């Protein structure tokens, strides 16, 4: 969790507040101080190595979030946890030389 | 499929050289008869992996 936190690839709530809009391009939340902030989601941007930098929303409309609560997952993150691959069912055995 | 057959006929009997670096002895280069294969990878016989 902390790796994706300090990498600034995910998106988190600046303060306590409630989510009012959620779509693939933006997440708008109304915070305590009364401000309305919409957070643009970077979508299919190109990294130095050509990998897709893509953020995806992880909150629902009307969801009340605390400060530091996750709003959008960055690349290689699942609900705020580093997601560098897949969990696959493996069998440890030879197999016809392949 | 007409020209894949054509490529198969020019390949027949011919050999290509396969080289893995570093070439430490002469067996770092060996000649094989090519078999056309699906994918993007060269398929290397397992008994020659020691030499390479």
């Amino acid at each position: 969790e902390r790796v994706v936190r300090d990498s600034l690839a995910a998106l988190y709530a600046e303060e306590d507040g409630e989510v009012v809009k959620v779509d693939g391009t933006r997440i708008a939340v109304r915070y305590e101080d009364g401000r309305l902030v919409e957070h643009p989601l970077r979508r299919y941007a190109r990294s130095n190595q050509g990998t897709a930098f893509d953020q995806r929303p992880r909150v629902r409309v009307g969801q009340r979030v605390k400060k530091g609560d996750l709003l959008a997952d960055g690349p290689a993150s699942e609900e705020g946890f580093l997601a560098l691959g897949q969990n696959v069912l493996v069998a440890i055995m030879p197999f016809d030389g392949y | 499929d007409e020209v894949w057959d054509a490529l198969e006929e020019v390949i027949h009997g011919k050999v290509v050289l396969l080289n893995r670096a570093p070439t430490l002895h002469r067996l770092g280069i060996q000649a094989f008869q090519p078999v056309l294969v699906e994918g993007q990878s060269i398929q290397l016989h397992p008994l020659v992996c020691e030499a390479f």
């Binding site: 055995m93 030879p94 197999f95 016809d96 030389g97 | 397992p46 008994l47």
Partner: protein
């Protein structure tokens, strides 16, 4: 190595019997294991060498296919004019080397059928096949050792 290695079990810890009928009876009570070394009359043997006495390899490998036997069990089998005490796996290996080389006589000449096959004996086998048979026959043998090598490694899990 897995098919040419031989089982040795603990249960029959050198138990002695006067007749093979007594040993086969003790095996049916579960007092002696199949390949546990035992003494019948004065000779050393095991239950499997008394229970399974095959006329030819095709009968021995047929029995293994029917689940009555594993390739690693030690058994009496008649192969190439003499009555051998060996495992079906060791017979299978000789069948593999023989049919790749073509002549099962000279195959039996350069195979060490009394030990598990390993890195060095296989390496020695390849060299002796190169000397006796030549390049292409040794290449066919290597492909055969490859095929049955992977196939049996997967089979045994």
């Amino acid at each position: 190595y897995y098919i040419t290695q031989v089982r040795k079990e603990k249960k029959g810890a050198g138990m002695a019997f006067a007749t093979p009928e007594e040993a086969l009876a003790a095996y049916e009570r579960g007092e002696v294991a199949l390949n546990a070394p035992i003494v019948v009359a004065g000779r050393e043997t095991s239950v499997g060498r008394l229970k399974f006495v095959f006329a030819n390899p095709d009968e021995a490998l047929l029995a293994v296919a029917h689940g009555l036997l594993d390739l690693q069990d030690v058994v009496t089998v008649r192969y190439l004019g003499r009555r051998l005490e060996t495992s079906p796996g060791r017979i299978l290996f000789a069948r593999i080397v023989g049919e790749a080389v073509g002549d099962e006589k000279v195959a039996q000449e350069l195979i060490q059928m009394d030990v598990p096959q390993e890195k060095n004996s296989l390496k020695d086998l390849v060299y002796q096949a190169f000397l006796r048979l030549g390049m292409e026959k040794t290449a066919r043998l290597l492909d055969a050792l490859k095929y049955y090598g992977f196939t049996l490694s997967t089979t045994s899990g």
